[PDB]
Amino acid sequence: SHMCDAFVGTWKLVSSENFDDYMKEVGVGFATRKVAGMAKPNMIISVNGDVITIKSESTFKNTEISFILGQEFDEVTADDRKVKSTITLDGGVLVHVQKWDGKSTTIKRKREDDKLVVECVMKGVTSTRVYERA
Ligand SMILES: CC(C)c1cc(C(C)C)c(C(=O)O)c(C(C)C)c1
């Protein structure tokens, strides 16, 4: 067994708070914010050896990233930012930092009770998105 095994599974978004404001802070345009904010994605997380894959599937966009912990990769985000991403495990929490254009945002993914909690931070603005097992 692997430590990320707690994250492995198919997850569905059941609540989202302050995501529009998070997206504003990130720089997402009006029309993208409106459509992306309406999305209720399924998040699919799998682990194969050292490689973790996180898929996001919704009516807005289907995204997929695969990565090894601590090793930087290029990511194109759902809002079409080209970012440099590094994901690490810090005391059981997946910490995902995205860097682009001199800016930085951090997305934390945590297991809490039976839920998977995603905290998105851009400067002083935090959005909390909660997922349950699908
Ligand atoms: C528009 C940007 C900021 C964004 C969009 C999405 C969806 C709606 C495709 C997601 C997500 O995969 O939940 C995320 C997560 C990485 C929180 C970010």
From Swiss-Prot:
Protein name, entry field: Fatty acid-binding protein, adipocyte
Binding site for a fatty acid: 129-131
GO cellular-component term (any): cytosol
Annotated positions of the N-acetylcysteine modification: 4
UniProt comment concerning the protein's domains: Forms a beta-barrel structure that accommodates hydrophobic ligands in its interior.
Keywords, alphabetical: Acetylation, Cytoplasm, Lipid-binding, Nucleus, Phosphoprotein, Transport
Gene3D superfamilies per the UniProt record, alphabetical: 2.40.128.20
Protein's gene: FABP4
Family, similarity comment: Belongs to the calycin superfamily. Fatty-acid binding protein (FABP) family.
Function: Lipid transport protein in adipocytes. Binds both long chain fatty acids and retinoic acid. Delivers long-chain fatty acids and retinoic acid to their cognate receptors in the nucleus.
A Pfam short name: Lipocalin
Motif placement: Nuclear localization signal: 24-34
Keyword NADP included in the entry's annotation: no
Binding partners and assembly: Monomer. Homodimer. Interacts with PPARG.
Entries under InterPro entries matching the protein: Calycin, Fatty_acid-bd, ILBP, Lipocln_cytosolic_FA-bd_dom
CDD domains for the chain: FABP4
Modification Phosphoserine occurs at: 15
tRNA-binding in keyword set: no
GO BP annotations listed: brown fat cell differentiation; cellular response to lithium ion; cellular response to tumor necrosis factor; cholesterol homeostasis; fatty acid transport; long-chain fatty acid transport; negative regulation of DNA-templated transcription; positive regulation of cold-induced thermogenesis
Compartments in which it is found: Cytoplasm; Nucleus
Gene Ontology molecular function: fatty acid binding; hormone receptor binding; long-chain fatty acid binding; long-chain fatty acid transmembrane transporter activity
Record PTM Phosphotyrosine, positions in chain: 22
